[PDB]
Amino acid sequence: KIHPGVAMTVVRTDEILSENILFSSRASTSMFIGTPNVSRREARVDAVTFEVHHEMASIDTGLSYSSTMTPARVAAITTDMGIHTQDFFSVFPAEAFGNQQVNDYIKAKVGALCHGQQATCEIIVTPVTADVAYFQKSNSPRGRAACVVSCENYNQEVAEGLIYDHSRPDAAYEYRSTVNPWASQLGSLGDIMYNSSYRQTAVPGLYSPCRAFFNKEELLRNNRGLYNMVNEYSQRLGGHPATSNTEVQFVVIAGTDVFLEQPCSFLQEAFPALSASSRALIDEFMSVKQTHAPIHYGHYIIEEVAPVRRILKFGNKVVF
Amino acid sequence: PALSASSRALIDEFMSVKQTHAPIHYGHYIIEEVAPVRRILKFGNKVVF
Amino acid sequence: IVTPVTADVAYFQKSNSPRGRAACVVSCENYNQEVAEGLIYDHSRPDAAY
Amino acid sequence: KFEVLLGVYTNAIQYVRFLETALAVSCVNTEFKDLSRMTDGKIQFRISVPTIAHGDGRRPSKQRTFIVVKNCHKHHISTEMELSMLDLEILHSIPETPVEYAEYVGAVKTVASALQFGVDALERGLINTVLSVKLRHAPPMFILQTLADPTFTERGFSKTVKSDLIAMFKRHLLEHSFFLDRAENMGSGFSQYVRSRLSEMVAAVSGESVLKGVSTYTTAKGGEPVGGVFIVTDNVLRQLLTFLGEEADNQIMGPSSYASFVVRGENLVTAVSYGRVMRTFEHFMARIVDSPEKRVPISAAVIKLGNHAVAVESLQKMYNDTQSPY
Amino acid sequence: DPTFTERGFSKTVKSDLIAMFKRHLLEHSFFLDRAENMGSGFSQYVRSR
Amino acid sequence: STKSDLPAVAAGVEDQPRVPISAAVIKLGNHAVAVESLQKMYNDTQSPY
Amino acid sequence: RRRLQRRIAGLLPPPARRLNISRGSEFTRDVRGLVEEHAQASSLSAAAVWRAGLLAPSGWRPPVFGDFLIHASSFNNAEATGTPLFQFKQSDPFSGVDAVFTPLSLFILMNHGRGLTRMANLLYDSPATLADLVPDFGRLVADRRFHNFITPVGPLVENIKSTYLNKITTVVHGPVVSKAIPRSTVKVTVPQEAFVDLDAWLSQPCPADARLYVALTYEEAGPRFTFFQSSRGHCQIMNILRIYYSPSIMHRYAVVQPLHIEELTFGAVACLGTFSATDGWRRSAFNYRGSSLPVVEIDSFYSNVSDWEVI
Amino acid sequence: MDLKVVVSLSSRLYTDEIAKMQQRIGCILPLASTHGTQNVQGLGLGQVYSLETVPDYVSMYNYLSDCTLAVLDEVSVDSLILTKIVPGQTYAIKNKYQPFFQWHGTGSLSVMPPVFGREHATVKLESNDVDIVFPMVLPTPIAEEVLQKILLFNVYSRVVHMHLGSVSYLGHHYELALPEVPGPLGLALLDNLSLYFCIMVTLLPRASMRLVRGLIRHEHHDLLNLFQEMVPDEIARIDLDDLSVADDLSRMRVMMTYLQSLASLFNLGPRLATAAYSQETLTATCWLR
Amino acid sequence: MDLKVVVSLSSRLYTDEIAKMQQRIGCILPLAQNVQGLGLGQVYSLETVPDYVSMYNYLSDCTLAVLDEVSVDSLILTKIVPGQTYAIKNKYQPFFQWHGTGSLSVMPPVFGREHATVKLESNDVDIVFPMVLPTPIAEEVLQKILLFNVYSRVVMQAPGNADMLDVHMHLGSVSYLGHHYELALPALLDNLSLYFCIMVTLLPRASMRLVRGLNLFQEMVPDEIARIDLDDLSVADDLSRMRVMMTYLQSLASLFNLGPRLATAAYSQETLTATCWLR
Amino acid sequence: LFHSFDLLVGKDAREAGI
Amino acid sequence: SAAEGLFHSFDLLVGKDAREAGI
Q1: Name one GO molecular function term (chain A).
Q2: What is the Cα–Cα distance from D19 to D14, expressed in whole angstroms?
Q3: In chain A, whose CA is at the least distance from the CA of E13?
């Protein structure tokens, strides 16, 4: 239980099944209903396989947005919101150390189905002197926030500077360049972990949440205009998905049956979950919500901010 | 879990301030009951729920 | 039930099973003896909550 | 010592209709259909936007017309209905004895419950694809709380207004997501809060739209036009008739738009309504004999949001007949 | 509640359904004695339950 | 159809004379449930309800 | 006779359409009859499914059948229909009788010398005539040549009853249909205790037809028959069973002696047919008067037996 | 049997993409399903061949031999139509492929993943962010050499090699893309070949060594040019014995069944039988063998 | 559908040609319509050496066809497809019995040219038919002809290790399901024996490169005489050796699969005819 | 004008039409 | 093209009283 030289920014994703409300104005679209037509497909000698085929053409009349959808209420947090980490010995099984006797020993000391999904969390190495004030609001897990929709559309070179050039300071924190250097520059340790150009030897089936904050193509997909980047959000892009109901979060192979949308890929920010540094600040948070200490002498506690106000109950001390 | 206590001290202050009390002291501890029946607890007249 | 002295008090404030592994009865599987008993008695895999 | 058979029962199939459900307020069913026949899926609009004549000599206040081309969404829906050939063999045979006449009537009912399966498949397929269009063109409410308000835009999309619009998206995603959760946590702000959020949705959606016409989908009680429709799940439907309490009409819309499909959409399910399956197979058996010798009420609740009388409707009941995801 | 039966009864639905069972037991068991905790909102609370 | 199945499902229930019986009726909105208690029957028998 | 004429009018292929290019006015009624035939062979009415029954005689094929003559003593008439039969290669020139094996009789051929055992020994209580029915069993599984003398002939579809000299009719190649002129569909009955679904063992491309594989192997207890079901190809399923046979390569490592070429060979697999991958396998229960065992029921089978490809 | 799937696009096709698709009509495309309407997301070889990971063509061989096969007939705006390939049906397939391998022999062709580079068959849709890759169609004698070059770069990564990388065809020489590490299933296939070789190295006869000795010393064929007049001492030390007939026949029986196993191990990807290949129309009437 | 293919006979036959065709009507015949390259007879001519590998590669390339009627001016035959079935007959002068064997091989006839031919004297060509035979008989005659080639070459070079009569004792006759057939063995088939020879003498270095590719587990199972080798070789000759190694191994392995493998269901020994479908 | 463009665009000539 | 979004009502045939071709 001795501190290493580095710290972490543990990042996971949290699914939530949300009962939604869809609204659309009258005469939003015009529709041509084609007559249904039948066609045999497989003339089996036992039982012929039919097909009843249909065509319909729907044109969007309203030049503005004539339909919107709100996430009305939460039903059930389908994921764990847990502690189960990713295992890079499963992600990159091709690389190992020099001696085999130390390789199997390392695989022995680490890891080589009665709850929901287990919310496989990524780990980003950071220096220890990152201030906690960055870590208390909607931020990005690396240093520089992605105000790339703010830039000019269809221009990769100026957009590359506001994401990887640290000669200019950040969009939010104008007095520092990055909260961490080991994840924010172009070829950093955090950049060789979850980007496209160095995950060539990765197993494609598993899912990592940090791909939405390190894959360079989808950072630069938001380079385009806001009338395109809110069009592409509700266009079922599914550039950063995860599975609906399994044990471990897998990236779905273009699954169209599950309905989902990711604002953590849209505006490229992560929300701080409920953490602490001891049980003492945890019990101090539930006792006094308004007068809690967010900072103790060496310790700290980051109160959670989220789209869903997840209610906590510890015994009978209940906060909202 | 039922309404335990590691000492009478932690159960004699829990009845006073049922919200901002200490759930864990230095060596002692108190565990509130979370049962499906909310039992009326009466100690003197300091009635908690 | 005899337990060691280093059991955490955060376990005994939540509605759990009195032993260590929360016995996933339906949460394991349906009708086998290698997955249910594996998730209930084999501690090589960590339990459901912690 | 007998065994009794107390009865054998079957469920009726509820004939949904797209022009009966309230989702057809959002889509007009026109009688042109050249665009499906047209190769290119686009259509070119000559719209005309007004502008204010400037009073100063900053720039000449020119005319403005936009030539916008709108590409159509051509969708293909296709089910299957496996039907066994040993029913086809007694379809083709003529029956003469009451055992084979009973088997023939049973196989005709099997076929008449396959064509009706096809009609009830494409009718739910049509409404499913309509719903999947309106989830493909609906950015969420936490964007249109700001972007549909001209206080931020229409000064020029610079770096700065986008840099503040992103940070204002971040606020409505926090303080205003899951709005029906906060209404429960709030006390006597039950009714007017959800009325506020619904009327903000109506103000954020209902704006400039080309290709307009007559007041379609009038109700029955007041006779006003229905502005929009609220597709929801059953839990929020059961809640939002209590946070609102009262509805404008008695769940009746009175649309005379459903007049060109009472002849065109009814004779497609009437031809498979088992009066015509048996009739056509009797006609085919007569040919085999010939061979060897040689307006309305619409069930939809109407709520009132200021001036616009939108409708609420839950299709969960329709998706629950299929036991599929909503 | 049909939304929890929208998907099939998979392996992972049978975990949070148990969690929802235990939550409903801890909160909404004995719906009548906790109706007496308020005096004004009795009738609407019992009509809701 | 359903209406043509109505004399088939109603085997003899429609063709019965109807007498008024005693019960207390709650109206839970559109349903009108009938509350009743049988403990006055079970206390003629000295047997637990 | 009039019933026979009115029935033979129904089973009658339609006349082909005509085009009179020579005359002009006849081309009008030719294309009018063409659009009249198309519009009531396309639109949603009963006239659409009416045209699906004429079958247009690449779509439908009559299957072949395997007519064999066995003894009634090696056969149990109480079995269900789609039972995968295993003909044995006979060495005599003019024999006439062939050793067929239902999987219950195959099970008591397997275990004698070493529930499926209960049902197998309840339908086929005598092991003398059936171990006598083969010429040799222990040496033929010792030399590992028992696979080439076992050939599958597909499921039974119609068994004519007989006191002696029993005759079985089985679909060897093609779509499995019953033989009676009143039509029925034969469900292939395969017992579950020798069956497995390989996707339940693997734990994504939606195929056309999922095949049914039989893999006789030479286990150290004795012969073991397994009815494999997979989503894949023949050259694929041999690789999948190469991954599955993980203790088999350990056993092959176990035998130090290479000159004894018996223990280097571990069974052979055979593709029996192709069923509907969408309309998947059902579990059913074939009953006897003593017990009832779970039996995997497959419908709509298209059989084409493959050779014994050696693992 | 109207076998006609309509792969509808999510978004409108642009004009340069329309010309790119309409240039390639009649080429082999793999489907994920066989059902009556599919989507572009799930179409083609792009789900298993991505720009993200290593090109592992052996799992693509196995996906191709597993999944159904199709050829492209119609590309319009917002939609493209595919026609499935079933056994018993003869299809017209045009040689519109950028590695120009002429099917002048009219033998059995082979569907192959695009080992020859993604960029010539990476045919792009920016309607939806999807990268359909067309699998390459080539005859069997070039298929066996590209498969042996795939299996040989993995074993000759440790120890000129341009002859190993590039293909040897009689008309032209095209350079193919070679990954350094093959992947999981390519290494699994090479490991299966390694265990086959380590087991059957002792199941070889001994008169063939006397044959190669007497034929290199006595009558030099054209086929004995690979040794360049060189014999190891392993040939003599398995020629120190006397030759027999019964154990050699039994070793040969298990040798024929093991080389049948080798044949069906190397037979990857579907094989289509050509019939009356037309060079002038550049199409070939073929059924799936 | 139509499937009746006519071969354009320019020359009218004589009566003995009709007799020699009506003897072998039920057998199969390959294809390329023209009449010169209509069969496998163009390999068995005096134009090319009777080589095996190119004959098998042509036979796997070329389609097959069964013929039902023979006239004097038209050769009527139906070609083979994987769709439907045909009735074929074993009418080969090397006779083999199909007593319930569900598998059939179409191998090139190594029973001699005269044993499988129809010699057309008036016509331009000398046609042959390929051997249709059950697959265990096929692999057995492959073994007993291949080892006869190898064991005959070894006694042409030095008969001090093998004997012609002793290998002819065991390799003179095959025996399968009681029917005891004879192998008329008398160059022919030298390409295949040389291919197999150089391949099995090239496999040791291939297996050692394979075991050094990826340890002592799979290195134990080779024998101590096939394990010891000197590992000193340049990259060029060894690269060429492994390339031609897996080349001729693919040729050999696809050769030991016997082409388009026919399958039969019910063989009538009375009529010598069985239902046959392509497999 | 050879077509059926009446109910798609509407009734009025000042707002809409062809 | 310029016919990318427009309907067309009729044509103008250049003096061809029985021909459907031409400009």
Answers
A1: structural molecule activity
A2: 14
A3: A116
